Amino acid sequence: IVEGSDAEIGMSPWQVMLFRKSPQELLCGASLISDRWVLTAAHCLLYPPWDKNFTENDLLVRIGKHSRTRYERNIEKISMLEKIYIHPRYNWRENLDRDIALMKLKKPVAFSDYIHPVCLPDRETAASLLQAGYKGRVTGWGNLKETWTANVGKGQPSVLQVVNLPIVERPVCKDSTRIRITDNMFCAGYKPDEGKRGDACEGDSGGPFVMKSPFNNRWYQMGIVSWGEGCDRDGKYGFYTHVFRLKKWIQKVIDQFG
Template structure:
């Protein structure tokens, strides 16, 4: 027989026994099988089955929600659903219920109408901020109640219809509005031929090319009444138009820098459609100040842009209204990707012909940049773009210089270019070259916000004022 252990070695004192064998009282332990399921009793104190959990909740959806977490942990831990999506745990997985405007496993994709899709629904400018569309409007418009439409606050709003390197026809400002080179428009120095650049006579036809057959603004059609209300014309002392311009506001005209060397004195006319008859809308304005970009390069026509300030304000009316200035990013993403723009002017109707007596307009397609560069014998800088036809006899020509290149978007016209130069007019395989206005919108805005008196401008009756402040060369993309 085995040896019997002493009683003291088998039995422990009461307090020690409770410390070793103590067991928590089960929830609802008295007649528990007769009571409704209890989560604490069924699944916390011991492992439970799905059926036991179902007894607790008595609802399949609540049971499934609990069971998915109970069985394999909370898959929603860490908030995997983005953009305020709601997470629902599952067995080894989770499901996101996305907020309005988002989709995807984690609500990572926006379904909103951002700017790349129908301009975000905006009438005019569109930009994206934190996954949201923000619409805004050009000067003279305010956002409508829907925060997308633009409502005019003026009777004649901008951009609306109111019912060889031949020069398409030069003042000087750096990136800071205080960095100005100013010239008295009453005395701009020696008259410069409008047909010579880089030592080449661009009015001469190439060998075997009959300039008289080039029917062009060259080409185009007459502007109907109210169709080209932003057109301005620079007129010399002989009362001859020599360059065009674009009305930006009641005081400011945009033109090409090279135009400012083509007359000793000039005025600006607006409202003209036919130079041989008066229609009652024509107005002549003296120029108070001219400002050309400080980095204008005479040899290449880089930075070919200038702004004129008038002595007296333009009275907007039928046939006289400004074109809209766009926002830079929006212009480059939306306007410069349109198929066509519109140029207008009183320039020559063919390469060796006379200036047109009527204002003409021409729709010209934008040209791919690589095609543009390959077509030209001269440098196409980042401040230029090409437009026109490589075979059709339609183009801007001499006398159109400085004039408007505008682009239509939803029935509003925006300034996108300045007629600058071209190799002849309407030559096969050659395009018109335009100053890219979107590169200079901040520059233009600074000038328009600077009062003439604040920058030391002088009256045309006084000696010419010239002041140049050197500006550093910013980096450019490779050509």
């Protein structure tokens, strides 16, 4: 996360960390949507141009963590993966269309003050909140800068980072990049004319873009950190997988596959 701040304790209790098991390496973010289902980005698990094809046994998740500078005994939890589902039309060849995956946990987690699931948007939340200029919130332990920067560094922070960023109108998203954008994506970030800065970056993939409903005061996961070009460049915007658009897939996997 670039130009974010340290999270308050319990501020993002749906935050999930996706680690490589051998050796232990933080790969991506993720989010908790029940005691046993975690959302992430497909590319965190499967990306053939890089010979990446992680199986259930390659990975583990950590939940309820605030700081990497401590084992948070009695608070943080771990699970191995029972099953991975990648969207069957995830487009790794071209543009990461449908950059979404579900992971089912071998050890369902007990909810606590630090561990709690996020909502998925209903139609009303999507229509009302997915508007240019409306801000959502992005969280992660990924890189602090695109490139090593004096007096900041680059790579992973100790404390979970948080940044609030406005949704950007589709034509501006489209015009910002030569990569082909689709309706299963949106973009967010400040424009050069707004002065404020901030973005996701490498390592934040799979983390949630959440918005708080003014109607019922619940948090809803609208996006998944998916891709960008650099981080926090002027005239560039982070790209997010559009959770609502892909929700019927999520529901079918959870409702039907067991």
